[PDB]
Design a protein around this ligand. Structure first.
Ligand SMILES: Nc1ncnc2c1ncn2[C@@H]1O[C@H](COP(=O)(O)OP(=O)(O)O)[C@@H](O)[C@H]1O
Lengths: 302, 294, 309, 299, 305, 305
């Protein structure tokens, strides 16, 4: 049983905050996609229903993609347009989709693929990727057809906010709503590629939980770096969950996104790293009062 | 039996509005092309020049369907490399893919190359040039090549010589030379068509008549929802106006329709009605919701 | 075995029409070039023999260059002088890696290659200039010869160009006929005043001039050749049960239209197609005997071709 | 034994006045950098620095001092001399010079420090991505990179951001963010290589005055030594020293414009001095500001 | 016994006319420089390196040479335009200084080096400023084994655009008033790097010579043009006389051509050309050069037998 | 007993045609140069009297230099500015060659004359090329030969193509009239450094080609046109012979077209075009090029089997 767009958007409210319009768009796009897949097209035409996500870094683009897969118990796989002989590395995205699908051709065709940082391959070699990756969107020894699978392409599109303004001539959100296929053309994306991404949802707000993860999960997350720096000091650095969240809020209030996370952590651990080599303690705990208030000093355990 | 240029242009009037001269040119070019193949001799290759969303791509597809001939697209920008030479032959394997791997019917195929004006300086102009002449073993000498493009600066070079629809008519092979296209390449595109900026009635029929028109698609999507989707004439016209005001042409039609039927497709599977009527006030004003009939 | 200049020019007559003098010059220049390499220069002096093509756009400059390569099974590569006009200094060597690409990275065969630079007349700094001249010397390093390790001393360099103003400077000098007669009086000092630097022109000892095709020349190309345009359409209309007749006043009218556009013989087809367009359109929808193409149908383009039932 | 950030900042107080926050930042950045090298890393932050301060605020002086305090090979380089494809091979020149002053010792060279001045001048780009290759390391992974610059327009972009609806430069530059440098002209991939950011304040009048007195090589101490070997005692009245500081600020030359001011004032004196027989020469304020009255002479 | 700045400037008045302020600056700069070497520095001590800024033919090079002769000190020139391999060509300026110093390390360290056309290497570029940093290592001081810390460095240049940058700052007269307002920051915007200008604390400026200035240059200097030709004709048994109306006529011709004092010789040579040609083929007493011979260039020099 | 400038110019009329003004200048310059050395300059100033030749290719610049040496039985040696850090020791090579043709006599070597061709080519690679100007400057000044380069006369030739343009943008007739208005500042903007031009006070200008000058350029040079075609025909088993009437006939055609030496090749190619075309299709011994083959262009080159 396919979940109605109402139910889809509803469950997205549990994992992602805000972006009500973008989720309303994804709900319909996803619904129509599988409402078409479980129909085998037509025994007539039908809209591919692919998606193009456009939002700031840490707005929840990746989070939304993963959630849509879990809500439909469908095999999900990611891929960066940056890390894309690469014509045989693009087909790798498929074998990975099968890996998490137990090599089931049918369930693999029902899968979802998310390509991050599409805005990075806009020729304005990376251009040729738009074509190699385009070969999948259309559909061609897996024997699996890359037609049935849903393709979601994310990206921040920094300059996109400018091209739209030079055309429509409010806030970035109001501008990204006026986004048009021709705007992405001038940005660097080729016509044949954009025509393959009909649905277009924009994100305007940043996601607290998205930023919180960027501080933890990534192999090179800020916490992991400072914990390694303090580590070679013989001192264990501990970030409390209330602190990480407090860091995410300070980033949003400044609209600096994920790029403004480092500047917040540095200011919080500066005083500590200064007079740290001049002490002899065990570990330094970072609380929320040390971030938000910035009044109290990080706890020190001797 | 080959359809006379009269019949070809006539059926093009059903899918595309206006551009009567460009269609008159394509009709003859296409007719002569297959009139040459079916008798065992000009290459008769075409070069489309028109604004974005004028119907360049639509015309190419239609010409294929009207002749039950395998059709395949390709963006020239994707070609602009040394390894892409083996990707230039990729356009063929796709043509064969949609042709059931038939060497004979693949030679009768139509190939469209979008954004030729984008590669105007060069390596691709000479690499893709190899196909135009003809070299899967399938010879590209038989297949028809249609190269599209907007050619923004072309309107200027022509003026500095002749000194938009009237200027593009005075277009000459030497004008494309100064634009960036190499001589050996332009000589392979004898036939050159020109498309004028589409009108309202133009966009209206593109929403209805084409076998894959937007309305036909959504009427089929709502159809598998047990709901009949009805587009009022006042709504279609309302959609055409929105498209021109944004200068997106035909390419900006989908983006308009999607936003207008977005809310409806969202809470549709959560209802039990008979049909939804889309009026003008639902598109232009975007305030009133589409009529629902239970 | 090396093809004598006679054989070289002979095979050039198959791919290119006219330009008998320019081909006579290229034949000798090319022959002497490889006659120098296959003999290892001198175990004594020897001219570089680098060529400079000067002809209108669509006169066959590029076509001649390619043919000379195919006739000698030698790796050929092009390059536009406009796309060159400091980082481009490392882009000038790009022309070499491309020559190796089509040479399967064989150093010896690559040295036997031919390089054609189009639009040299565009980088002449005369009344950006400082940047455009920087290429004349950057490309000059090649003509002489220096991680492909390949030397550019062996490869033949052919530089093409239309040289619009060149026809004027020569006239202001020889002054005391036609363009073909004036371009024959071309001198290294004429190219100097045009914008080319002395050190560069001295590297192009051979200068070939491609005269503009005469009306008579074009008229014959539309008739004589076994694959002439008229013979093509007369065959196309023939399989329609309709005889196609080209009046001599029309053929001459097409030649004039071609010259006025400077498209040469390459622009003859585009003219013929536009004139028989409407005809081929509503032809299969009729039942006549023959269609006569007059001059008023080509030049004026107003009157329709005569129809005889 | 590595010097604690406390000791590092302490020794910086001897060579540079003020900038206590910037020095607190450099102390930690430098300490962490070598604390990472002496432990062979392990993730670990590159810990590269970006200096932002007015001309003559002590950006270059701070860089040199950090090297001397760690007996580490130091070398400079101007970013304006990089802005060019052949310069890609000139980017490595900065390395051969680092080896020159390092006696060609690969290990000690890797422990070296490189200062690039006038980075704010190359903000559009080809250099930003060329010099970028070094920051990563091809090795250039071990050496510390300090990029200086005045960043004139930076004070404006920050204001158009930190504003709220409708302070001093030292307060605005503190609110500096990686995105501010983005709009300024620096590319994202480059700024991400300079995690550590320090901001310098325009040396106050009192700051300049001290630079003319306290430093063991202060201008006054030099000229007093010059006049000393003439049998003439040179006295700098306090009203005169501050007069020189103001002349320096009004010109925005910072501390670098201090010498040019002192010379012009003592020029006429140094000319007809060897042709006299006096005891001392007193320099008042009227000799600097007005430049009208001649320095007091006492036979 | 070191010459007092008074004596130094005084002897400069014999070789160079005008530029009294620039010479007052050089006198002090030079005096302080050697007053520092003879006392072995110390405590700090200002380098006192000089930067000459004046029009072409204002006497920048002449001043540099004279300062060397007045102190019997080895002198050597070098054009900044001639300056990675050039880094080893920079030390060539040193081996040449030793050549004219008989390879005496001590006397070589007391030498003076003049770099002309510094305004030409200002990046306003990659290889251009590479000299500002290479030639920089010298100013600080480094197989001669000779240290360059001791040698005096004088960098000359016309600095065409410098007159403009100063104006865009001093704004709220003549060139000689604007160049006086010159500041280290002005040279920064011009193309010179900060680290380089800080090595040239001293900055002397020269004005544009006038008619009366040029006239004296043709007479007063011990190597004046008139004295040279009067000596050339002297060894011909012919006395050469220059009327005051002629010398002034020469100055005007020089100013109208904006060549300054550098274009004085080219005018004198063309005037006495025909005379020097058919001179050895005569037997006269003296040749008088009138004004009509220079300005008009029509009438021939008066000939007395 | 020195030959007066009158006698010097007179003997130059025998070897070179026209250029009466340039020869009048060289006569005086050369006379003054040796009139200076034979008097030991001045016991206990004096112009270097060095020369700078400026004329089209094949105007007789080189011919004039050689003649001045033969007329004074003085050791002469050439050198190209093109063939010039290591080259800093290749500049002194010009001296050892001067000694070679001087039998290693230091005194007679100091009385020698050195001609540097194509000086206009080293005017700012801009770094290396320009550097030759100062490296070559060391000689003009004067420094194991032990010989001083101060005594030897230096004549620097060159075509200076762009020089005709810079002069026009300044004085704002014919080229000759323009080159007469030449000034030291014009050569400055051209690429020559100030310190170098000041060493060449004398500036002579040519504007007329010489038949005998061009005839030599077709024969003497190791890379002469005749030697190149004789080598090309050589590898065809055919000896190419250029009659003296033909070479002279080529020089004429070159001058009538004012194309100078640059237009010599375009003349020879056209004359040997038809020959090189149907030559590989024959079996003869040699091909003789007569005058009637060049001028009239009617008769075909003689063929001997
Ligand atoms: N904080 C300081 N204390 C003492 N002297 C200083 C200070 N800052 C700069 N100076 C003096 O200024 C001179 C040049 O300053 P510089 O390093 O160029 O500053 P910036 O890096 O801001 O250009 C140095 O020689 C130094 O003596």
């Amino acid at each position: 049983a396919l979940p109605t767009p109402h139910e889809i958007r509803n469950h997205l409210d549990d994992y992602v905050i805000g972006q009500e319009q973008a989720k309303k768009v994804l709900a319909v796009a996803v619904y129509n996609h599988y409402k078409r897949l479980r129909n085998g097209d037509t025994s007539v035409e039908l809209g591919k229903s692919n998606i193009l996500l456009i939002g700031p870094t840490g707005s929840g683009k990746t989070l939304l993609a993963e959630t849509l897969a879990r809500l439909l118990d469908v095999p999900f796989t990611m891929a960066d347009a940056t890390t894309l002989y690469v014509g045989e590395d693009v087909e790798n995205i498929i074998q990975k989709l099968l890996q998490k699908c137990d090599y089931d051709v049918q369930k693999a065709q029902r899968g979802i693929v998310y390509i991050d940082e599409i805005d990075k391959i806009s020729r304005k070699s990376g251009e040729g990727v738009q074509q190699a990756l385009l070969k999948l969107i259309e559909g061609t020894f897996l024997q699996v057809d890359t037609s049935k699978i849903l393709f979601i392409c994310g990206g921040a599109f920094a300059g996109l906010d400018k091209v739209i303004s030079h055309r429509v001539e409010a806030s970035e959100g109001e501008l990204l709503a006026q986004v048009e296929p021709e705007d992405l053309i001038k940005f660097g994306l080729i016509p044949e590629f954009i025509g393959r991404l009909p649905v277009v949802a924009t994100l305007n707000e940043l996601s607290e939980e998205a930023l919180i993860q960027i501080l933890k999960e990534p192999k090179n997350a800020l916490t992991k770096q400072y914990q390694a720096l303090f580590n070679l000091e013989g001192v264990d650095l501990e970030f409390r969950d209330e602190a990480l969240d407090a860091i995410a809020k300070k980033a949003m209030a400044r609209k600096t996104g994920a790029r403004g996370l480092r500047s917040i952590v540095e200011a919080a651990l500066l005083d500590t790293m200064y007079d740290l080599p001049s002490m002899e303690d065990v570990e330094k705990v970072v609380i929320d009062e040390s971030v938000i208030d910035g009044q109290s000093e990080p706890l020190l355990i001797y």
